[PDB]
RNA sequence: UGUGCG
């Protein structure tokens, strides 16, 4: 026991670093004799070792004296006001920059999370408090998961730690100086799956848990036999039938009447719409004049780069270099742009860049000519009168202005020459600075309109109509206006008729005319915009939100083709041949409206059309459907949209039209899903937060259980109330009471819960497939205090489970979101894994199972094929109404060694979740406080407002709400899925007991599809009363089991819907608008190739789901146009815009890139393909495999290709074929957005906990408080690509324009641009070694083509290496748009060659795209298939 | 840290 003591002492005395800081601790450590003080000094030394290593690694001065920040700043001579007690482990100063380096070690993930969050909040508080001291402070937190350091090596450190732990055990068994809590904490922090984590926590469950368990067992019988359960179900059904016939229970479903449903839809808003059958021509007339934007879109706005634009661009560029004062520089620049404009006007009588008496200066500013000249005169006079007081020289104001201009231009040229850009690349002409320059500016006068912005709605310059809805002119104008609105967000901050001297502006050209979007506010916020023109000013004025106008920016052709395909869906319908233009017009109008006025109310109105059309083609629908489909509408364009939708519906769903119902259903469903075109982002964050809190709070108030601000330790009143409400939840009566069943009230009946559990227990539901001391411990850098040690019924000793409430924004509103701590997330994950496995043991759940979803799809298709009855069910308020106590009771009453212990732990965790505390958002509390103050100081008084006001009048302010009646939306999702599965199995069993038929159910959390067998369908057709009684009994049973069938659920034989997938007979139902909108809305600020890959994935799934390939090619062209607007060069490896069906079905992304390259250089790819075929045959037998991956893939490129060609007996590519190249801006380093596979492996390996945990946690906490928009993402992408994003070989940062200018300097290199804008360069082989400045940025095209073709051949087969013969004009075929065809995709030694190819080819992610899900089913068009190319092995 | 309408 002392041999290891002497060994450890010798080890530390020999291998300790000889740092002056460690000397005192080493002297203390070695001199120790007693085991206790030896343990203390070993812990001391470890703490100092990690602290000092952290201080030195990050370059900071260690805090040995542990002085406060006050003492540090005062000792360094800087005074600060009083602050909180914060003592960092490390601190350093440089200039005015102060860095604190608080450090810690946590071997556990939950403890690490808690410590990092606490440390970050402490430093944030200190920084906010010191911001008054005018001193910078950037925090750095160094948290490591291990004790390893650079002062002590690994193995001796491990031996020291083990010996210290053994010494601790010895002292605790002998002296017991440490408290058992502190002893356990230190042992845990010294020793360095989740269900067994509850074994080490003390069981402190008192009588509260026993009372809860008794409550969930009281009145429940889970031992009923199948006979007794069947008799009880039969008695319940007979009583229900008798009461339903007598009218005591109201029927929740009605037989579908098409005319009645249409009439209900027509009178949906009959309080202000004083019409029902609107004329289509009058609707067009109203629509073209409804809004200022809509007026501008359909009006008659109709009518060589000049020097003003060149000078504006140059001076815009040189202002970011801060040549320097800001106001002075701005004024000087204004004068130069004015000179350029005057030069243009006197040269060719130009008129661009002017808005009457104001001109377009830098930073998107309108500048008044009068103000410019007065300011220039004042500034020149002031400088002249200042300077001439010294000497007597001719001032010559013109000369003074010229000299200032030359000085500014010289400084700007010097600044630009550093980054690699010369002035001649901006094409600026110095002739604009005439010798007569001052007088020329001061003797300049203009006459024109005065710019104005009308903020209020108190006449139109042009004729309000004339542009036809059929054409694409309206979409083009909307595209230009949307781009201008989005660009208005990029302006940097500078300092009724509202005509102004200076404001901000954006330019756009329409029909050869210049228009200016004028605004007076900067930022990504809603503001007033005014469209103005030089001829007549103030064309229109509106109040748009700029970050809601992204999807239309370059989508004119895409949207037009979307509408055209939708219209072609219904074109052979005979009754709609006369009313075919109107339909088209209506469709267009709806789209245009939702793209010009993107409103949440419009989004929900368009969404509800889906449920209307689903009920229209059904047999039975909920009686409350119509009330749910109606929304409050405020704006007049919303009522116009409703009228247009009503007209379209009444034309499509006319009684005279009965020809092709599947096509009309698809058309109306796509019109409904057009709601995805409107962005899903919140219009107002505070209003949506208020709505989310009301949705969270009203059900609890109706139930009657709301605990207001509960403590971590529960007061006896709160526990008593929780027990009472647990008893109340199971005290739901139904069908055997005077007042009858009360629908939609949360809770379950004891009788029906007993029936469910008994049926599960006896196997009725299964199938054949189943059967000093404390202070120093605190001072330690690795001692853990965040670990829970005991647990009660209310939760762990560390406190009850906290959940922050927020909203996840989506189409049709928001869904509630609960965010917990890491420890709470793991505790919940235990329950989730248990219930996921328990559901996996059974079948019918499609939530997480993927093959089960395919089984459900096949069953739905088979049901629809035979025209059997399908019941598509949504469950309303699945989250808020359903309760963790329900899950606890069900689990306690179910019957399936360690199983009893696992059930006990699960019950404890569910009891924890019962007592969870949800934190009211602080914005909501502040809004309620402001409303309360303004109401009490200065009539609706909503339920939530009444709640807050009642709490405010009695003192305490609500912060946390605890209630039995809530499960987190997505928190207990696997548990909810399991409950839905078992409850619906029991309900189907009861229905099969009652009738003769069976129901096949495929539940998934809240969504569900029930397929009725033949017997039930016959019952519906011949005995409607009994079928309706069965449906009502199903509704009643679901209500008794706390499953409230939504009013949007439908029973019918036409369509089966499940998880947003629709299936009918014969035809397919693609959500074309949904996929097109998803493609148009996903543009981020990632690296451009990543954006291309994401868009390619989206287009791949859209093609697989039935979108025609030409629309997808148009979407790809839209993405390339977005990239071209950022002026990013379009290399041949971004997107392919001439694809076909075979490219997406047979091929993959690599194959599409091969097709693009082969399109670019047809003749240079045949010989490469021949050599590749020879190579593939050589390596198929096994030879040439080992002498190719190491002799050629590592050698220099463009030189080994001829070696391969001569080695395989084929003609090597000629002189010119090697000259083809593409410009790679990431040749040295990836672009700044703020071997590839090797770095990917590194990042994945250093991600989870052992390495990179601190990095990933820092990025997560930085990106948590940073939320942006799609339009904000696009403007950020434009800013980043226009900035210095290109990294040179030596860590330098350059512009893309710098690289382009350096390329343009060399005359040998020539560019070649594709028909779609793809640029590839021909570099003469006479130069690849002389001037290596930018030749290093080029990559030969043939080598990348070879690598990609070889990798594609390995992953897909030899057919990709064959000759691509184009399609042969067979004859003439029908072009039926709804003529689909299903298709299946064509699916160790070569893995090494693949990974060797990927490290060699820095062009595309080849081997890493396997795991990032390949589509296993394609639905394409027969006409599109028969025009695809042929690629066969020969 | 953008000046870019395919
Ligand atoms: Mg410290
Ligand atoms: Mg559904
Ligand atoms: Zn001009």
Task: Judge whether A364 and A333 are in contact, CB under 8 Å.
Answer: no
- Torsion of the alpha carbons at A820, A824, A825 and A826, rounded to the nearest 10: 170
The three-state (H, E, C) secondary structure of A964-1023, written as one string: CCCCCCCCCHHHHHHHHHHHHHHHHHHHHHHCCCCEEECCECCEEEEEECHHHHHHHHHC
A98: domain range?
A: 3-192
Inter-helix orientation angle A922-937/A685-703, to 10°: 90
Cα A789 to Cα A797: distance, rounded to the nearest angstrom: 7
| Length in residues, chain A | 1434
Question: A483 beta carbon < 7 A from strand B?
Answer: yes
Classify strands A1310-1313 and A1319-1322 as parallel, antiparallel or unpaired: antiparallel
**Is A307 near strand B, with its CB below 7 A from some atom of it?**
no
Closest CA to A828 of A217, A107, A113, A110: A110
Nearest Cα neighbor of A1033 from A232, A237, A255 is A237
Identify the CATH number of the domain in which residue A63 sits.
Answer: 3.30.70.2640
CA trace torsion A1131, A1137, A1138, A1141 (10° rounding): 120
Q: What angle do CA A998, A761, A839 make, to 5 degrees?
A: 70
Ligand number nearest to the C-alpha of A1010: 2
Query: A850-871 b/e with 16+ CB inside 10 Å = b?
Result: eebbeebbebbeebbeeebbbb
Q: Is residue A1211 part of a domain?
A: yes
* A927 Cβ within 7 A of any nucleic strand B atom: no
Resolution given for this structure, in angstroms = 3.0
A347 CA to middle of ligand 3, Å? 9
Q: CA-based angle A603:A605:A608, to the nearest 5?
A: 110
User: Alpha carbon of A543 to those of A454, A626, A680, A1275: distances in Å?
Assistant: 10, 33, 19, 20
The β-bridge relationship of strands A142-144 and A103-105 is parallel
DSSP labels, A537-583? S--EEE---GGG--TTSS-HHHHHHHHHHHHHHSSS-GGGSTTHHHH
Residue A797 C-alpha to ligand 1 middle, in angstroms?
Answer: 27
Strand B closer than 7 A to residue A317 Cβ: yes
Three-state DSSP at A1096 gives: helix
Distance, in Å, from the CA atom of A228 to the CA atom of A526, rounded to the nearest integer, reads 65
> Alpha-carbon distance A562 to A576, whole Å?
19
Q: 3-class secondary structure for A491-510?
A: CCCCCCECCCCCEEEEEEEE
- Whether residue A351 lies inside any domain: the answer is yes
Let me know whether A83 and A170 are in one domain: yes
Contact A963, A947 (CB under 8 A): no
Residue among A684, A970, A973, A974 at smallest CA distance from A819: A970
User: Cα(A889)–Cα(A212) distance, rounded to whole angstroms?
Assistant: 9
A48 touches strand B (CB under 7 A): no
Q: How far is the CA of A443 from the C1' of B6 (A)?
A: 41
SS3 state at A713: coil
- Residue A1102 maps to a domain: no
Quote the ligand 3 centre to A306 CA distance (angstroms).
Answer: 5
Output the CA A79–ligand 1 centroid distance in Å: 24
* Same domain assignment for residues A454 and A536: yes
Beta strands in A362-471 (DSSP E): 365-368
CA of A313 to C1' of B3 (A): 6
Residue A144 lies in a domain: yes
Distance between Cα A110 and ligand 1 center (Å)? 21
A352 shares a domain with A318: yes
For residues A765 and A986, is the Cβ–Cβ distance under 8 A? yes
How far is Cα of residue A873 from the mean position of the Cα atoms in its chain?
A: 28
Q: For residue A146, how far is its CA from the centre of ligand 1 (angstroms)?
A: 16
Residues with C-beta atoms within 5 A of ion ligand 2: A 872, 874, 1007
Q: Is A614 annotated as a binding residue?
A: no
Q: Is A235 annotated as a binding residue?
A: no
Residues A968 and A887 sit within 8 Å (Cβ to Cβ): no
Q: What's the CA dihedral at A335, A340, A342, A346 to 10 degrees?
A: 160
Interacting residues of A509 by C-beta distance below 8 A, sequence separation 6+: A480, A515
Q: Work out if A1142's Cβ lies within 7 angstroms of strand B.
A: no
Nucleotide nearest to A481 (CA to C1'): B5
C-alpha distances out from residue A726 to A394, A835, A963, A968, Å? 96, 22, 10, 18
Vertex A1233, ends A1231 and A1235: CA angle to 5°? 40
A157 in the same domain as A59: yes
The answer to whether A102 is annotated as binding is yes
Q: Is A89 a domain residue?
A: yes
Distance A1123 CA to B6 C1' (A): 10
Strand B reaches within 7 A of the A1126 CB: yes
| Pair A794, A711: CB distance under 8 Å | no
CA angle A1074, A1075, A1079 (to 5 degrees): 120
Please state, in angstroms and as integers, the Cα–Cα distance from residue A1222 to each residue in A281, A359, A1130, A1342, A1376, following that order. Answer: 54, 41, 9, 10, 41
User: Which segments of A122-206 are extended strands (E)?
Assistant: 136-139, 142-144, 202-203
Residues A275 and A307 in one domain: no
A407 with A305, same domain: the answer is: yes
Query: Distance in angstroms, CA of A1317 to C1' of B6?
Result: 8
Separation of CA A1012 and ligand 2 centre (Å)? 15
Nucleic strand B near CB of residue A322 (< 7 Å): no
Å from the A1415 CA to the B4 C1': 37
Q: Determine if strand B comes within 7 Å of the CB of A1121.
A: yes
CA of A1049 relative to ligand 2 center, distance in Å: 7
Distances (CA, A) of A130 to A76, A78, A333, A1171, A1262: 15, 12, 38, 69, 21
Question: Which residue has the closest alpha carbon to B3 C1'?
Answer: A313
Helix ranges (DSSP H) in A1265-1307: 1270-1282, 1296-1305
* A600 close to A675: Cβ distance less than 8 angstroms: no
Q: How far apart are CA A1425 and CA A1423, in angstroms?
A: 5
Q: Are residues A174 and A287 in the same domain?
A: no
- Residue A14, Cβ neighbours under 10 Å: how many? 8
Strand partners, A819: A804
Within a 10 A sphere around the Cβ of A286, how many other Cβ atoms?
17
Give the SS3 label for residue A289.
Answer: coil
CB A733 within 8 A of CB A747: no
Nearest protein residue to nucleotide B5, judged by CA and C1' positions: A480
CA of A352 to the centre of ligand 3 (A): 6
d(CA A757, CA A763): 10
Q: Which of residues 1265-1304 of A touch strand B (CB under 7 A)?
A: 1278-1280, 1282-1284, 1297
Is A814 contained in some domain?
no
Whole-Å CA distances, A258 to A573, A621, A1369: 19, 12, 46
- CA A1126 – CA A1123 distance, rounded (Å): 5
> Of the listed A115, A373, A680, A700, which one is catalytic?
A115
Token representation of residue A199: 């074994």
Question: Which nucleotides in chain B lie closer than 7 A to a protein CB?
Answer: 1-6
Give the C-alpha separation, A598 to A675, whole Å.
9
d(CA A890, CA A883): 11
Please give the tally of structural domains in chain A: 4
* Per-residue tokens: A1059: 């998880």
Closest-approach nucleotide to residue A482, Cα vs C1': B5
Question: Residue A876 CB closer than 7 angstroms to strand B?
Answer: no
Please check whether residues A264 and A328 belong to one and the same domain: no
The answer to whether the annotation marks A1057 as part of a ligand binding site is yes
- For the CA of A321 and the C1' of B1, the distance in angstroms is 9
**Cβ A1284 vs Cβ A1293: under 8 Å:** yes
Domain boundary among A192, A216, A251: A192
Residues A168 and A265 grouped into a single domain: no
Residue A798 located in a structural domain: no
A1319 touches strand B (CB under 7 A): no
Instruction: State the Cα–Cα distance between residues A322 and A329, nearest whole angstrom.
Output: 9
- Boundary residue ending a domain (A1053, A1080, A1107): A1080
> How far apart are the C-alpha atoms of A1219 and A1342, rounded to whole Å?
9
Q: Is A115 a catalytic residue?
A: yes
Q: Is the CB of A111 under 7 A from strand B?
A: no
Alpha-carbon Rg for chain A, nearest whole angstrom, is 37
Q: Does the nearest atom of strand B lie within 7 Å of A312's Cβ?
A: yes
3-state secondary structure A1132-1192: CCCCCCCCCHHHHHCCCHHHHHHHHHHHHCCHHHHHHHHHHHHHHHHHHHCCCCCCCCCCC
Integer CA distances (angstroms), A689 to A504, A828, A925, in order: 32, 25, 11
Taking the stretch 1059-1078 of protein chain A, residues with Cβ within 7 Å of any atom in nucleic acid chain B are none
Cα–Cα distance measured from residue A659 to residue A1378, given in angstroms and rounded to the nearest whole number: 14
DSSP H or E stretch at residue A104: strand A103-105
Cβ A1313 to strand B below 7 Å:
yes
Point out the ligand nearest to the CA of residue A783.
Answer: 1
Centre of ligand 3 to C-alpha A308, Å, is 9
Q: Which two tokens stand for residue A165?
A: 């732990």
Instruction: Give the nucleotide at minimum CA-to-C1' distance from A1122.
Output: B6
Interval between CA A78 and ligand 1 midpoint (Å):
23
Taken in order A44, A46, A48, A51, the sign of the CA dihedral is negative
**What is d(CA A274, CA A1097) in angstroms, rounded to the nearest whole number?**
48
A308 is in an annotated binding site: no
Q: Is the CB of A362 under 7 A from strand B?
A: yes
Residue in A551, A452, A567, A552 with CA at minimum distance from that of residue A498: A452
SS (H, E, C) A810-822: ECCEEEEEEEECH
**Residues A639, A527 share a domain:** no
- A200: CB partners within 8 A, 6+ apart: none
Q: How was this structure determined?
A: cryo-EM
Close Cβ partners of A237 (under 8 Å, ≥ 6 residues apart): A990, A994, A1033
Same domain, residue pair A580 and A494: no
| DSSP-based three-state secondary structure for A1341 | helix
Please indicate, yes or no, if residue A711 is contained in any of the structural domains: no
- Among the candidates A132, A165, A192, a domain finishes at A192
Whether A304 has a binding-site annotation, put simply, is: yes
A1256 burial level (CB within 10 Å; 0-12, 13-18, 19+): middle
CA A466/CA A453 separation, integer angstroms: 26
Residues 498-517 of chain A within 7 A of strand B, judged by CB, are 506-509
A602 and A525 inside one domain? no
Instruction: Kindly report which amino acid residue has its CA closest to the C1' atom of nucleotide B2.
Output: A1279
How many CB atoms lie under 10 A from the CB of residue A442? 17
Distance B1 C1' – A1287 CA (angstroms) = 14
User: Of the candidates A1345, A1366, A1411, A1394, which has an alpha carbon nearest to the alpha carbon of residue A1153?
Assistant: A1345
Q: Exposed, middle or buried by CB within 10 Å (0-12, 13-18, 19+), for A443?
A: exposed
Tally Cβ neighbours within 10 Å of residue A1017.
20
Rounded Cα–Cα distance for residues A72 and A75 (Å): 5
Q: Is A458 exposed, middle or buried (0-12, 13-18, 19+ CB in 10 A)?
A: exposed
Is residue A1398 annotated as involved in ligand binding? no
């Amino acid at each position: 026991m002392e041999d290891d003591m002497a060994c450890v002492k010798d080890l530390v005395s020999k291998y300790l670093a000889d740092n002056e800081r460690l000397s005192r601790q080493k002297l203390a450590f070695l001199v120790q004799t007693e085991p206790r003080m030896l343990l203390m000094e070993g812990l001391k030394l470890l703490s100092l070792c990690i602290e000092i290593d952290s201080c030195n690694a990050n370059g900071c001065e260690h805090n040995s004296e542990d002085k406060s920040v006050e003492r540090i700043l005062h000792d360094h001579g800087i005074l600060t006001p009083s602050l909180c007690f914060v003592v960092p482990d490390g601190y350093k100063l440089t200039g005015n920059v102060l860095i604190l380096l608080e450090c810690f070690v946590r071997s556990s993930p939950a403890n690490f999370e808690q410590k990092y969050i606490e440390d970050f909040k402490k430093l944030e508080q200190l920084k906010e408090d010191l911001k008054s001291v005018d001193i910078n402070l950037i925090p750095l937190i160094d948290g490591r998961t291990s004790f390893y350091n650079e002062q002590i090596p690994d193995w001796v450190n491990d031996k020291l730690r083990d010996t210290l732990f053994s010494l601790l055990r010895y002292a605790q068994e002998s002296n017991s100086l440490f408290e058992e809590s502190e002893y356990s904490r230190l042992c845990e922090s010294l020793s360095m799956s989740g269900v067994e984590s509850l074994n080490v926590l003390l069981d402190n469950r008192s009588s509260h848990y026993e009372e809860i368990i008794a409550s969930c067992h009281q009145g429940i019988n889970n031992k009923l036999t199948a006979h007794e359960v069947k008799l009880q179900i039969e008695e319940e059904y007979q009583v229900f039938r008798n009461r339903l016939r007598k009218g005591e229970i109201t029927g929740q479903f009605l037989k579908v009447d098409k005319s009645r449903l249409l009439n209900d839809f027509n009178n949906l808003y009959v309080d202000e719409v004083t019409a029902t059958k609107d004329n289509i021509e009058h609707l067009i007339y109203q629509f073209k004049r409804a809004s200022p934007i809509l007026r501008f879109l359909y009006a008659n706005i109709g009518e060589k780069e000049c020097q003003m634009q060149y000078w504006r661009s140059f001076l815009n560029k040189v202002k970011s270099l801060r040549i320097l004062t800001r106001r002075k520089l701005l004024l000087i620049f204004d004068a130069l742009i004015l000179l350029a404009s005057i030069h243009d006007q006197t040269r060719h009588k130009c008129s661009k860049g002017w808005l009457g008496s104001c001109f377009i200066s830098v930073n998107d500013r309108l500048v008044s000519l009068e103000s410019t000249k007065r300011d220039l005169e004042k500034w020149v006079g002031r400088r002249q009168q200042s300077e001439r007081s010294n000497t007597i020289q001719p001032p010559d104001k013109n000369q003074i202005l010229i000299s200032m201009f030359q000085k500014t231009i010289l400084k700007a040229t010097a600044a630009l020459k550093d980054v690699g850009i010369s002035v001649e690349h901006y094409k600026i002409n110095m002739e604009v600075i005439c010798p007569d320059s001052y007088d020329l500016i001061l003797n300049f006068d203009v006459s024109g309109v005065v710019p104005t912005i009308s903020y209020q709605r108190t006449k139109f310059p042009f004729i309000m109509g004339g542009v036809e809805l059929l054409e694409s002119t309206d979409l083009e104008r909307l595209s230009s206006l949307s781009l201008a609105l989005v660009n208005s967000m990029k302006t940097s901050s500078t300092v009724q008729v509202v005509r102004c001297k200076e404001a901000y502006c954006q330019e756009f050209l329409l029909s050869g005319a210049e228009f200016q979007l004028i605004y007076q506010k900067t930022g990504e916020c809603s503001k007033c915009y005014a469209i103005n023109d030089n001829r007549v000013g103030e064309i229109c004025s509106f109040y748009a939100d700029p970050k809601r106008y992204f999807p239309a920016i370059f989508s004119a052709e895409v949207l037009q083709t979307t509408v055209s395909t939708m219209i072609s869906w219904v074109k052979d319908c005979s009754e709609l041949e006369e009313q075919l233009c109107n339909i088209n017009s209506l469709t267009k109008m709806i789209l245009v409206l939702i793209l010009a006025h993107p409103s949440k109310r419009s989004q929900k109105l368009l969404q509800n059309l889906r449920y209307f059309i689903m009920a229209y083609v059904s047999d039975y629908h909920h009686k409350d459907l119509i009330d749910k489909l109606r929304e409050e509408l405020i704006t007049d364009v919303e009522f116009l949209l409703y009228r247009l939708v009503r007209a379209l519906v009444n034309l499509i769903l006319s009684e005279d039209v009965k020809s092709m119902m599947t096509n009309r259903f698809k058309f109306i469903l796509n019109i409904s899903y057009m709601c995805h075109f409107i962005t899903k982002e919140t219009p107002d964050r505070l209003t949506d937060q208020i709505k989310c809190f009301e949705k969270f709070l009203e059900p609890k108030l109706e139930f009657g259980h709301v605990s207001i601000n509960p403590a971590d330790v529960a007061t006896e009143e709160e526990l008593d109330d929780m027990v009472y409400n647990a008893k109340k939840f199971l005290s739901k009566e139904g069908c055997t009471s005077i007042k009858g069943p009360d629908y939609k009230k949360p809770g379950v009946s004891k009788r029906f819960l007993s029936l469910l559990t008994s049926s599960f227990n006896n196997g009725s539901l299964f199938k054949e497939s189943e059967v000093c001391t404390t202070a120093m411990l605190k001072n330690l850098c690795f001692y853990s205090q965040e670990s829970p040690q005991s647990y009660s019924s209310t939760g762990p000793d560390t406190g009850r489970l906290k959940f922050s409430l927020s909203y996840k924004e989506q189409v049709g509103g928001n869904r509630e979101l609960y965010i917990g701590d890491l420890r709470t997330k793991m505790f919940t994950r235990l329950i989730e894994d248990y219930f996921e496995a328990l559901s996996l043991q059974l079948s019918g759940s499609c939530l997480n199972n993927e093959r089960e979803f395919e089984n459900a799809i096949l069953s739905m298709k088979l049901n629809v094929s035979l025209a059997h009855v399908s019941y598509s069910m949504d469950h309303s308020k699945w989250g808020p109404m359903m309760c963790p106590f329900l899950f606890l009771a069900t689990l306690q009453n179910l019957i399936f060694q360690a199983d009893i212990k696992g059930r006990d732990y699960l019950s404890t965790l569910l009891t924890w979740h019962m007592h969870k505390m949800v934190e009211i958002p602080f914005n909501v509390v502040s809004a309620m406080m402001k409303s309360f103050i303004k109401a009490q100081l200065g009539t609706t008084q909503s339920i939530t407002e009444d709640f807050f006001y009642s709490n405010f009048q009695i003192g305490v302010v609500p912060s946390h709400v605890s209630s039995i009646l809530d499960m987190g939306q997505g928190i207990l999702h696997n548990t909810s899925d399991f409950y839905a599965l078992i409850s619906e199995r029991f309900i189907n069993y009861a229905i099969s007991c009652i009738c003769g038929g069976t129901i096949d159910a495929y539940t998934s959390s809240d969504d569900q599809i029930s397929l009725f067998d033949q017997v039930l369908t016959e019952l519906m057709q011949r005995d409607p009363e009994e079928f309706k009684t069965l449906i009502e009994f199903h509704y009643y049973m679901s209500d008794q089991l706390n499953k409230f069938v939504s009013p949007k659920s439908v029973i019918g034989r036409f369509v089966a819907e499940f998880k947003s997938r629709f299936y009918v007979w014969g035809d397919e139902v693609p959500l074309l608008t949904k996929f097109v909108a998803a493609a148009l809305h996903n543009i981020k600020c990632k690296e451009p190739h990543q954006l291309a890959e994401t868009i390619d994935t989206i287009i791949d799934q859209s093609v697989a789901n039935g979108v025609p390939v030409h629309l997808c090619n148009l979407i790809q062209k839209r993405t390339l146009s977005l990239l071209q607007y950022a002026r990013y060069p379009i290399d041949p490896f971004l997107l392919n815009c001439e694809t076909d069906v075979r490219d997406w079905v047979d091929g993959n992304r690599s194959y599409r890139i091969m097709r693009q390259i082969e399109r670019l250089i047809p003749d240079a790819c045949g010989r490469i393909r021949s050599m590749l075929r020879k190579l593939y045959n050589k390596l198929k037998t096994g030879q040439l495999h080992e002498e190719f991956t190491t002799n050629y893939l590592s050698s220099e490129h463009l030189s080994s290709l001829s070696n391969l060609c001569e080695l395989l007996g084929v003609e090597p590519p000629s002189e010119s074929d090697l000259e083809f190249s593409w410009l790679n801006l990431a040749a040295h380093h990836p672009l700044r957005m703020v071997p590839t596979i090797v770095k990917t492996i590194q990042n994945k390996l250093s991600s989870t906990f052992t390495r990179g945990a601190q990095k990933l946690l820092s990025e997560a906490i930085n990106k948590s408080a940073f939320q942006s928009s799609i339009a904000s993402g696009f403007v950020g992408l434009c800013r980043t690509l226009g900035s210095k994003c290109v990294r040179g070989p030596n860590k330098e940062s350059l512009y893309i324009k710098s690289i382009q200018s350096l390329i343009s300097d060399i005359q040998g290199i020539e560019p070649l641009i594709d028909s779609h804008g793809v640029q590839y360069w021909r570099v003469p082989l006479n130069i690849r070694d002389g001037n290596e400045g930018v030749i290093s940025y080029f990559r030969p095209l043939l080598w990348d083509y070879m690598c990609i073709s070889l990798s594609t051949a390995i992953e897909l087969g030899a057919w990709v290496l064959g000759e691509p013969k184009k399609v042969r004009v067979l004859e003439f075929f029908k072009h039926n748009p709804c003529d689909y065809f299903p298709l299946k995709p064509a699916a160790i030694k070569f893995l090494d060659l693949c990974v060797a190819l990927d490290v060699n080819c820095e062009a595309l992610s080849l081997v890493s795209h396997i795991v990032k899900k390949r589509e296993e089913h394609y639905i394409v068009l027969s006409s599109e298939l028969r025009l695809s190319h042929t690629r066969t092995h020969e």
